[PDB]
Amino acid sequence: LLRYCVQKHDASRLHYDFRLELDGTLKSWAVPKGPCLDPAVKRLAVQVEDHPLDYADFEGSIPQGHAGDVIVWDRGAWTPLDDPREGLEKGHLSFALDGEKLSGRWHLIRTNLRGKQSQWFLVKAKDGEARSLDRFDVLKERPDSVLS
Ligand SMILES: [Mn+2]
Ligand SMILES: [Y+3]
Ligand SMILES: [Y+3]
């Protein structure tokens, strides 16, 4: 019921935008190296600006001098296993994803370091959907848009 989406943003530096609907907006993290199904791998996820729910369906171009083009790399629904509001606040989200590419449980983990609160890490939870990185790299295996 709660919408999630991952956008592949080919800007100056390639990266993935990981979005989770909550309270009528999309909580968004910029994940430079993209999500990983390997529970042993920790991917940087820099918290960024909230985006409107309809942006989840956006494919196109962020104008030059402002930044490349964007596709919806994955989409579906997400479910928090623990209170999401208190989760973002305390700096830890335990949640499940139900989409095209990413599925199973995940963790968003924020650093405790003062002056670095935008620094999180996206880690795959050990479950049936977990896949070793050297056997299955979801970025390589499923590289294209789910809308076009
Ligand atoms: Mn971006
Ligand atoms: Y509180
Ligand atoms: Y399918």
- Token pair of 88 as six digits: 């973002």
CA distances from 2 to 43, 53, 75 (A): 23, 10, 11
Neighbours of ion ligand 1 (CB under 5 A): 9, 17
Residue 117 alpha carbon to ligand 2 centre in Å: 16
Q: How far is the CA of 142 from the centre of ligand 3 (A)?
A: 10
> Long-range contacts made by residues 65-71, C-beta under 8 angstroms, separation at least 24?
67/11, 67/12, 68/9, 68/10, 68/11, 68/12, 69/9, 69/10, 70/7, 70/8, 70/9, 70/10, 70/17, 71/7, 71/8, 71/144, 71/145, 71/147, 71/148
Binding-site entries for Mn(2+): 9, 15, 17
| Method used to determine the 3D structure | X-ray
- Which element (helix H / strand E) includes 84? helix 84-90
Counting the structural domains of the chain, the total is: 1
Structural domain of residue 147, as residue ranges? 1-148
Q: Token digits for 148?
A: 């076009």
